[PDB]
């Protein structure tokens, strides 16, 4: 199908309590495969999926080296950002960076990404052209100027079109047993009396991978968007995910309501109703 690889990084400064903590995780689709935490007793890139374990010592050495260096660079950047925003050295601040690539069924690049946030706000992002920059404010424009001067975008593009897609394809092949298997949702509807006058119908989706899914309630074939409580998709802890959607329904009206489920693990979309 279509697939992604993403690396996430967060550094959080903590003045008075040592250097900023650096945590990074790597993902293919919704499967974590690597991690690194600077507060670990012996910090190193660590495996988190079975198919990445077969990579040799040279792999783990290279990735660990990169992580260790990125930790130091983030710390310099955090100091830079205090200057750009005229901020004091007493407060805690946050630098986030995501990059990675999307590929289609034939494994060709669909889209690359490389973007930063500071204190929870967009700072600078590589545009979809992988050649120009979007800076959120005048501080970020100083970064943009430096990155244009040094032709940084060209370097990122080369990684994003080359190594990002080539290694993602490698990982997809090596983990084909899990990464290229969609687990369909186990679905049912429950009924939860509120009063004499109404009850809740809750449509469940359980045990599904990947996380992307559509759950909706209709009444007389009309979407109940504004009256549906839809919880955030949540991890079960066994690689799969869970979600539910609930509507408040007048007594005796239950059979007017249908729940609709779309997941890539399902050949056709599902229609469910309350079955007493």
């Amino acid at each position: 199908g279509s697939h992604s690889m993403r690396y996430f990084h967060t550094s959080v400064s903590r003045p008075g309590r040592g250097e900023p903590r650096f945590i990074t995780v790597g993902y293919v689709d919704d499967t974590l495969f690597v991690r690194f935490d600077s507060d670990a007793a012996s910090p190193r890139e660590e495996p988190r999926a079975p198919w990445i374990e077969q990579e040799g010592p040279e792999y783990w050495d290279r990735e660990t080296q990169i992580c260790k260096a990125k930790a130091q660079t983030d710390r310099e950047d955090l100091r830079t950002l205090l200057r750009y925003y005229n901020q004091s050295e007493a407060g805690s601040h946050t630098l986030q960076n995501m990059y990675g690539c999307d590929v289609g069924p034939d494994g060709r690049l669909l889209r690359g990404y490389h973007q930063h946030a500071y204190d929870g706000k967009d700072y600078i992002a590589l545009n979809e052209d992988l050649s120009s920059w979007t800076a959120a404010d005048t501080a970020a424009q100083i970064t943009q100027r430096k990155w244009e001067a040094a032709r940084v975008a060209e370097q990122l593009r080369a990684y994003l079109e080359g190594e990002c897609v080539e290694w993602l394809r490698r990982y997809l092949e090596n983990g084909k047993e899990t990464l290229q298997r969609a687990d369909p949702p186990k679905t049912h509807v429950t009924h939860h009396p509120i009063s004499d006058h109404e009850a809740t119908l809750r449509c469940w989706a359980l045990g599904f991978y990947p996380a992307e899914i559509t759950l909706t309630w209709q009444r007389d074939g009309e979407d109940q968007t504004q009256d549906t409580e839809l919880v955030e998709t949540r991890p079960a802890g066994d690689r799969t995910f869970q979600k539910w959607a609930a509507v408040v329904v007048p007594s005796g009206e239950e059979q007017r309501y249908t729940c609709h489920v779309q997941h890539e693990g399902l050949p056709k979309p599902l229609t469910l109703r309350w079955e007493p």
């Binding site: 690396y7 490389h114 700072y123 940084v152 370097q155 990002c164 290694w167």
Partner: peptide
């Protein structure tokens, strides 16, 4: 496999 480039803000 990670980006080996570190571009300073």
């Amino acid at each position: 496999r990670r980006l080996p480039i570190f571009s300073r803000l």
